[model samples]
Target: AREVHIDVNNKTGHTLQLEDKTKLDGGRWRTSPTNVANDQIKTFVAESNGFMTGTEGTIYYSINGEAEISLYFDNPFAGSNKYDGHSNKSQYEIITQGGSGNQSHVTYTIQTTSSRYG
Candidate 1:
């Protein structure tokens, strides 16, 4: 379950992009096919009110590409209160939630194994 479902809708203006990151073949990361088709892609997009400080979020994935087995999270309704769950330093499993008028949500899942490859 390499899960992925991020929908910020009009959640504060907008702020999430990586519209294209092609680097497949073995150490793959083929994303780019969202709109609910699963294959997961959309990358992320926050605007409308765009997470005004409250610890913004992003960084979908990056292992061989560096950045610490990447898969990131923040804004679980400010700091450490509403929700928080990160497993060690990899195997990815982030969850963020705080929605109001324009739908806000973040879901991540990446059962790691590529902490650094060719």
Candidate 2:
């Protein structure tokens, strides 16, 4: 349930660090990836590399020092017990809603066009 600490404010402008504990395969309390980097205490602000639905060109996130966002996923996380899960018809979709405070942004979006195999 942990490992969401991300700061990938793109243009690859030197801000990218991601983890999902390879999609929670570990099996520990909160699926420890170092306890998801100690719950990433604070600082969310993840955006960029985007396209599709939800505003601001999608692929969004924000927090002015707030924590406790149970889960989230975006940008081609795909699905299944291998890619770690998340694909309810995904071009990309991840928004959080559990309970807490001070969460100013959360977004996701992407379109589709090419596919040739099944």
Candidate 3:
């Protein structure tokens, strides 16, 4: 329910240059209306395949891109807890949660398709 909302402003922090994606026809993403003027650092990491569920799913990120970022595990995922609620391999680490600017790393990979019906 979100297109995008990349904001972490202070002039020169919202560096979003992710065009090397293979697909994003319907899974869609947004964030790029401009307005993040505080401590600076907006991010991006996908251009295709945005949501899925059954085991679990979610990853919509936005904030006044019309607003929608209160997504705390309604099904938003982080995997490998084992037992099969969800997770085969997932680990996300973004250190430096202060506010001064020094570390901004972004990674992307999303692939899910197994709807075995009988």
Best candidate (score: TM-score): 1
lDDT tens digits, residues 1-118, model 1? 1222343221111222332442221111223322222233344433323233332333433333332322343333333412233334554433445332223456443333345676
Worst 10-residue stretch by lDDT in candidate 1? 8-17
Per-residue lDDT of 50-118 in model 3, one digit per residue for the tens?
444212213333322222211111112232211111222232112212111112122221112244599
lDDT of each: 0.33, 0.25, 0.26
* Models sorted by TM-score, best on top: 1, 3, 2
Candidate 2: count of backbone clashes, pairs at least 3 residues apart or interchain = 0
Which portions of model 1 miss their true places by more than 4 Å?
Answer: 1-85, 89-102
Q: Write the per-residue lDDT of candidate 2 for residues 36-95, one digit (tens) a residue.
A: 121233234322222321111112222212211223433222221111112234332333
Better of 1 and 3 by TM-score: 1
TM-scores of all models?
0.21, 0.19, 0.20
